[PDB]
Design an enzyme around this catalytic site. Sequence first.
Site, mmCIF file in Angstrom:
data_model
loop_
_atom_site.group_PDB
_atom_site.id
_atom_site.type_symbol
_atom_site.label_atom_id
_atom_site.label_comp_id
_atom_site.label_asym_id
_atom_site.label_seq_id
_atom_site.Cartn_x
_atom_site.Cartn_y
_atom_site.Cartn_z
ATOM 1 N N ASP A 35 6.114 -0.200 3.331
ATOM 2 C CA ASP A 35 4.662 0.003 3.360
ATOM 3 C C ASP A 35 4.311 1.406 2.888
ATOM 4 O OD1 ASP A 35 1.962 0.016 3.850
ATOM 5 O OD2 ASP A 35 2.152 -0.028 6.061
ATOM 6 N N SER A 199 -7.907 5.978 -10.678
ATOM 7 C CA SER A 199 -7.892 5.127 -11.870
ATOM 8 C C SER A 199 -9.027 5.529 -12.813
ATOM 9 C CB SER A 199 -8.000 3.660 -11.474
ATOM 10 O OG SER A 199 -8.145 2.806 -12.586
HETATM 11 N N1 LIG Z 1 -1.597 1.073 6.612
HETATM 12 C C1 LIG Z 1 -2.799 0.870 7.357
HETATM 13 O O1 LIG Z 1 -3.310 -0.242 7.353
HETATM 14 N N2 LIG Z 1 -3.359 1.932 8.125
HETATM 15 C C2 LIG Z 1 -2.726 3.291 8.133
HETATM 16 C C3 LIG Z 1 -3.798 4.383 8.336
HETATM 17 C C4 LIG Z 1 -3.247 5.788 8.436
HETATM 18 C C5 LIG Z 1 -2.249 5.900 9.546
HETATM 19 C C6 LIG Z 1 -1.149 4.831 9.402
HETATM 20 C C7 LIG Z 1 -1.690 3.432 9.263
#
Ligand SMILES: NC(=O)NC1CCCCC1
Length: 330
Positions: A35, A199
């Site tokens: 992620d 972008s």
């Molecule tokens: N990846 C997300 O959906 N939210 C993120 C926001 C910033 C802190 C970590 C999680």
Amino acid sequence: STGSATTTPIDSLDDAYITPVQIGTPAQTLNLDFDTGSSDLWVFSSETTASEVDGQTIYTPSKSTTAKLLSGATWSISYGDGSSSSGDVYTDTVSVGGLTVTGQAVESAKKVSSSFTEDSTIDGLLGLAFSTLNTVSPTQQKTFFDNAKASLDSPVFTADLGYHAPGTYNFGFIDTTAYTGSITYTAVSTKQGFWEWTSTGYAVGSGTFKSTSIDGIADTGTTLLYLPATVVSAYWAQVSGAKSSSSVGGYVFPCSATLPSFTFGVGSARIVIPGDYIDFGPISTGSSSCFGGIQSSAGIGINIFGDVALKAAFVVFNGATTPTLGFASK
Ligand SMILES: NC(=O)NC1CCCCC1
């Protein structure tokens, strides 16, 4: 050093991608969602509330000879989709695709929200945004990439996501066979802890390119492409019968439609998302209303170049002292 791991879609829609990760000694292999929009490496574990586990593979720190409780450390995260998880923290050995980090913070879930329990294919997340977003308290922890960086041949990782097919995450090198043409690099702001870039504009199908700055994040952990309402309206106006549905929660379109492509600018370069990439299928089993892959960011507060956009490209996450992003066609 380098590492190279295959990433596999969890379902027939590419809702997310899982990559096998070795944790502990002997290895415990869990399938994690890599992620680039978050900074916590967290896993389903032997500590997770039993009623909140439904088919995931769990990490058991007591069976790892290299696991150490990080005394006093807790974590708690809430994602953009409303999901959440929390727990305590171990340090352990973590390997991805042959690349090993010792002393990685492995966040052990005591609690996960329903969407995590309900997805048996995702054993946890591996965050690849900047370590300034890591939630561990009272001592913030580093991402796997930040811990590996100094050992890597080059301080980079690359995302090569497949359309309805496996792809690759590489660490420490750029596979010059994996893309066509040249990589165009573009500036990054780390001010919000994301891979945030601008972008240079867009085109709908065979339409003329509109030059316009669109600030957003490269987020492998988000399925869809979220863009300003003006841009999204322009795209779905090209699809007969497409409409924004408040009841469904976004743009829907007739499943009988052939969707136009969507192009986004990276500097003077262009990445073309084929129309098929924008089809997320029936809103409910057997429906002839299909969910769109391009949606408004108006309700988010940020534009998100999620998997729909990223899987059309070979993407370089350059973690040099001044980070940058690179995009190539493939
Ligand atoms: N990846 C997300 O959906 N939210 C993120 C926001 C910033 C802190 C970590 C999680």
